[PDB]
From a paper:
Kallikrein-related peptidases (KLKs) compose a family of 15 secreted serine proteases which orchestrate a protease cross-activation network known as the KLK activome, with a variety of roles in homeostasis and disease. However, a current lack of approaches to specifically detect active KLKs has limited previous studies to measuring total mRNA or protein levels rather than functional KLK activity. KLKs are secreted from the cell as inactive pro-KLKs and must be subsequently cleaved to generate the active form, while endogenous protease inhibitors can further modulate KLK activity. Here, we report discovery and development of the first selective and potent activity-based probes (ABPs) and inhibitors for KLK6 and their application in cellular models of PDAC. We next investigated the binding mode of KLK6 ABPs by X-ray crystallography, to illuminate the unnatural amino acid interactions underpinning biochemical potency and specificity.
An optimal balance of potency and selectivity was found for DPhe–Ser(Z)–Dht–ArgPP (P4 to P1), with potency driven primarily by P2 l-Dht and P3 l-Ser(Z), and P4 d-Phe providing selectivity, as the only d-amino acid tolerated by KLK6 but not by KLK8. Biotinylated (bABP 17), alkyne-tagged (YnABP 19), and Cy5-tagged (fABP 21) ABPs were synthesized and validated in biochemical assays. bABP 17 is highly potent for KLK6 (kobs/I = 11,000 M–1 s–1), selective over KLK7 (>30-fold) and KLK8 (>70-fold), and >600-fold selective over two serine proteases particularly highly expressed in PDAC: urokinase plasminogen activator (uPA) and tissue plasminogen activator (tPA)33. ABPs were synthesized as a 50/50 mixture of diastereoisomers epimeric at the warhead, which were separated by HPLC to yield the paired active ABP and control inactive isomer (17/18 and 19/20). The absolute stereochemistry of the active ABP was posited to mimic a natural P1 l-amino acid, and this was later confirmed for 16 and 17 by X-ray crystallography (see below). Polar interactions observed between His57/Gly195 and oxygens of the phosphonate are consistent with transition-state mimicry typical for an aryl phosphonate warhead. The P2 L-Dht side chain is well-poised in the S2 pocket, with the indoline nitrogen facing a water molecule buried in this pocket that mediates a network of H-bonds to His99 and to Tyr94/Ala96, providing an explanation for the increase in potency imparted by this amino acid. The P3 l-Ser(Z) side chain contacts an extended hydrophobic patch extending out of the S3 pocket (Ile220), offering an explanation for the increase in potency observed on switching from P3 l-Cha to P3 l-Ser(Z), since bABP 16 shows a less optimal fit in this area of the protein with a less defined binding mode for P3 that varies between the two KLK6 chains in the crystal structure.
Residue numbers in the entry: 16 to 36, 38 to 67, 69 to 125, 127 to 130, 132 to 147, 150 to 205, 210 to 247
Write the structure that this text describes.
Amino acid sequence: LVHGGPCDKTSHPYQAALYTSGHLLCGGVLIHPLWVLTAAHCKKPNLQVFLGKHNLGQQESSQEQSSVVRAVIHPDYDAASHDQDIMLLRLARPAKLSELIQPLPLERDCSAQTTSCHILGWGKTADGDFPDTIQCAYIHLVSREECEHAYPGQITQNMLCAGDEKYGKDSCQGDSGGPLVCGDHLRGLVSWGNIPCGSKEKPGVYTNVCRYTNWIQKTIQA
């Protein structure tokens, strides 16, 4: 993510790192000891999940690694439009919760009043490189009508937009599937956005997690 800075060590216990072939692919969000939520476009064979991470290159006492035994892509995911960009990853064993590994509760209210949010991830930073330390930035939700104005014909009710008019703080490549946290609830998942990354003019676009309460509950409880 661009124009942010390193997160506080204790402030992101729900952040997941998704790896393939030993390298970062995407972010994700622990929402249940057995399940990580992420973007459908992060689907690849052989996903590996790391919980409790802060610095990717360090072997950290708090980290847990888990293979993914099932990846449930939303049935209505449309890769071409990025609509319904959400997927559930079943962990091979329940995460062992701690101060540094905790689920994040979902925002169930699509009309929730908190409009200032945090985004987090190990995606590309403003220098064009990938960071070792997880990055954080504070941004603000943008109305449907304003975001539709930025991306005509491309925004659905399953998307939520957020950005920063002053510095352009924004998610970027490698942040997909990571969390947009508003009022200490999961409000969105990093999905897509402008090229170059940077939200001064066009906001970042996030999967609208409040729309997926029923499917998530059904999938976890099966």
